[PDB]
Amino acid sequence: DMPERFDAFICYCPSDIQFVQEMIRQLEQTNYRLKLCVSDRDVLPGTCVWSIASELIEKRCRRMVVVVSDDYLQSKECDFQTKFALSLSPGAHQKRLIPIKYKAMKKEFPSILRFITVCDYTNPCTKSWFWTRLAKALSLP
């Protein structure tokens, strides 16, 4: 049934839901069998993701995937993600946050995501086994 522990929480704003659906579906098709959660799984019919209470995320989720876009930068989710990131010990950010950009942006990354490496889905050179390498990163202890 519902995991007590998850490989990742996926943080995203509603405007980006189509990418999240693609992402979860592709991750689910790798061999990695990740436990993924979101705030509300009801808006992601067809996937295996779980809903989780926001106050449990830091305790129960090894990492947080952050879907970054222009719309995200203006959302309520980005505010929550920023508070979450700031709660982490310096040096913990690179390990526990995985930002992912899927399309062009007119805006710069938020202060706390600028320094960490980004997963750039738009980059032609990432095109090799993209979802498998992401799954691998998420499975790591």
Phi-psi region of 129 (alpha: psi -120 to 50; beta: other; left: phi over 0): left
**β-pair partners for 64:** 9, 97
- The whole-angstrom separation of Cα 26 and Cα 42 is 19
Dig out the tokens for 35 from the structure. 């436990």
Dig out the tokens for 29 from the structure. 């098709």
Per-residue CA distances from 7 to 3, 103, 123 (Å): 10, 25, 25
Question: Which residues neighbour 28 within 8 Å (Cβ) at sequence distance 6 or greater?
Answer: 34, 47, 48
Secondary element (H or E) of residue 65: strand 61-68
- The whole-angstrom separation of Cα 113 and Cα 109 is 6
Method used to solve the structure:
X-ray
Q: Which domains does the chain have, with CATH numbers?
A: 5-140 (3.40.50.10140)
The data reach a resolution, in angstroms, of 1.8
